[PDB]
Symmetry: C3
Subunit: 340 residues, 3 copies
């Protein structure tokens, strides 16, 4: 929502309130998504300034406030900055920005990230190139220098983030993505490799001096249909946890498959079906083990551009004897969303 | 303050800066409110969208930022989401919303919550139905389906919130409230019962498989007078602490009494007097013990709809030999408030 | 950016997104500023309401969100309230405000706080009077009661803030500052003394029942030139740390010198040079030791009032055998800033 537009600078304030509850069998400790209150809220701004006829500068900030916490010590659990960056965009040259932003491999994994609540399981945060990561300098080019419409690409430099935990750390890396869009279809591929930190190497699970993440994707977004498919492969990058021996690390190799189909009815109801399967391989002590494996059946009711209800059902196919202890129960999310 | 109003969605941004200092005898450790800097700030939004002529959707978010902290490790102490919810309101049918919101029993305890700084002692947060609680689905009906003016009611389902601490947890519950308003008067009553969590049961103080909170109230809000009275009773719900044996839990039974009288002078000065007395009973090892017992004398000076000063004096009647260790000293709050 | 202006209340929303990276030799553990991602974002409001023709009320809130954190446990590290206060301003009488605000001695140290990223090293936060401190009641008078133009002064009462750590605590204090501005020049002096807390006294480093901070300054801000110089002296106030014996406390005495020179080119480039030297004396076990000692060479490119790039180089003169373990390596900051 544009709240300022004077003297060649415009600022949009964005926010949503999401009333959200998850339902699962017991405590939800052996379920896909958990059990209980998951209400959150989001606030941010997006400003673009016209420096000259060809040059424009921008900045985005986006923050998540959890409303499912109390007023005691747990008051901040889940609060985080999603995105926070600035950059410059010139004519038909491209754009450059640095900050906390989407990894370039999310240019591909975003195709199947359309479920009312869930989906996009492989797009972990603070995981190199698949999700929101800190310290990324990203060059992007749309319409290939204004010569070929629909043909976009991007190159990204990931800065080293040596943090307290191996889960949220990374070393230097490079990545890129190419995409084409024609008459309703979009195809995309993205790749990224980076150095691992010593602390990551020192974990039980995962072994290798380099992490690697790539993925392809196809989508059809027209005539009220949304159909998409993603395939991705990772090396030493997907974060895993053994809930039995209570160790953590990274999967030496994962094969990721995400499918999704939605139809948008005129009167606002948007049903969806989806498949998601992530298989880890060469896991220390375990061997092969599935991380994610479900079918999804859901629907969102759009009242208008500002209000929506949704239900999302996960038919979890993960077996009860999963070697890594991955939860095997189903989970249902029921949501009510005000956004501007 | 309305900052957006285009295409049937309006958004209000709200905020206040509250310069605030408390004065007490020693460290304030044996006082009502404490001693030192209590400056805070608040920010939120409130959006309502017109879906059709009869249906409207809304969302509220409200956040508290403490300014009395430092820039070190204590930087977030007191920061919290007060409210965060969305819902739908239809014609003369009623409204429904889910999220972190006021407990339905606060429909009654809000009558005496009008002191410049203090008062409303029984409306604890994260305490079932008396204050701000997370995961509440609330149906509300004003003017009894548009048939009887002044006659409002509400029913509320409290979701289970199993947290790390027994103080901030709760199980499933139901509650409701009815109110009538006529020629300046308002009468109200509210009730709520809920299951306790196992962790709550396992505490030294309090015993029972169910928590219970109810209260009645009368107010007179006209001719520049504000007069209100509240009476409430709780079972296994009021959080208590024994500062001697350093244990905590819940009071098996409390009797709550809150009175308040204010007059609003034309030139902005609004003096107030108030009484508050909360007596816990059947406390393990202690027996009977008062939790709150004071007289209040204060005044607010309203410069206008955006600026105010206030002083609030608590004449604390709690005895120095209180069995639970409740603080017995007086406390004075001096405040300066900018709000929009 | 003014987002509301109805009925004699105006509200400005402010924010910036700062993409920022520091470069240093190894881990940055022996460097001036460190090494890695330093992206942050800021949001706040500033409201002023016209109560009558002579009286106006105001309020400021300003918050810092770190974007260089992850989404795990370190998600809030660095998040803080910078400022949060309200007050009243009357005609030619002056202004009064209370809250978390700038110490009065910053009226002087702000002269040399103009580097693209660094500088202003002596203006520590939560350090009595030199930086952002909590619980300050400040009277300010501009143009000496409207009689002498350019002649401003301020008196400040610092409230006691007894916190968990000795670094961020303080006792009661008073301070003041006087400044004159004439044909492009500004001269200033400020003084402040305060009681130390018992916890501060109990530290290894620093000894004395009272803290003391004063400083003078000259600036020339015209004809596209910025030239400034600061000299300050502290007693028992400057926070120090011995990274060898891993102790902390306060310096019994510091001599502070800050110089800065900048030129603003028409086409947006603003190069800068600066010197900064802070010498601690009478340090327990150490004797004399330098805390800060560098030359700075940097430049900011201003695209316009909303967008800028900058590079800041610190030529660190601190010797590798510094007795307190102060880092001796150079550091380079590269920044891109969107602000409104
Ligand atoms: Zn965003
Ligand atoms: Zn995103
Ligand atoms: Zn509110
Ligand atoms: Zn409230
Ligand atoms: Zn500010
Ligand atoms: Zn400041």
């Amino acid at each position: 929502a544009e709240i300022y537009n004077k003297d060649g600078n415009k600022v949009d304030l964005g926010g949503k309130a999401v009333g959200l509850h998850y339902f699962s069998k017991g405590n939800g400790e052996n379920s896909y998504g958990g059990n209980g209150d998951m209400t959150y809220a989001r606030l941010g701004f997006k400003g673009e300034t016209q420096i000259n006829s060809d040059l424009t500068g921008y900045g985005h900030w986006h923050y998540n406030f959890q409303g499912n916490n109390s007023e005691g010590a747990d008051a901040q659990t889940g609060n985080k900055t999603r995105e926070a960056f600035a950059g410059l965009k010139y004519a038909d040259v491209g754009s450059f920005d640095y900050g906390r932003n989407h990894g370039v491999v999310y240019d591909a994994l975003g195709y199947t990230d359309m479920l009312p609540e869930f989906g996009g399981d492989t797009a972990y945060s603070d995981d190199f190139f698949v999700g929101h990561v800190g310290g990324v300098a990203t060059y992007r080019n749309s319409n290939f220098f204004g010569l070929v419409d629909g043909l976009n690409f991007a190159v990204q430099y990931l800065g080293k983030n040596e943090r307290d935990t191996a889960r949220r750390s990374n070393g230097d890396g490079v990545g890129g993505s190419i995409s084409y869009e024609y008459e309703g279809f979009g195809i995309v591929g993205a790749y990224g490799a980076a150095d691992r930190t010593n602390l990551q190497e020192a974990q039980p699970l995962g072994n290798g001096k380099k992490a690697e993440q790539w993925a392809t994707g196809l989508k059809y977004d027209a005539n009220n249909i949304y159909l998409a498919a993603n395939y991705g492969e990772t090396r030493n990058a997907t974060p895993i946890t053994n809930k039995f021996t209570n160790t953590s690390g990274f999967a030496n190799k994962t094969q990721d498959v995400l499918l999704v189909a939605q139809y948008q009815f005129d009167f606002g109801l948007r049903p969806s079906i989806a498949y998601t399967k992530s298989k880890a391989k060469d896991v220390e002590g375990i061997g092969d083990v599935d991380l994610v494996n479900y079918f999804e059946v859901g629907a969102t009711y759009y009242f208008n551009k500002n209000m929506s209800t949704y239900v999302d059902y996960i038919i979890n196919q993960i077996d009860s004897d999963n070697k890594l202890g991955v939860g095997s129960d189903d989970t249902v999310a029921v949501g009510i969303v005000y956004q501007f």
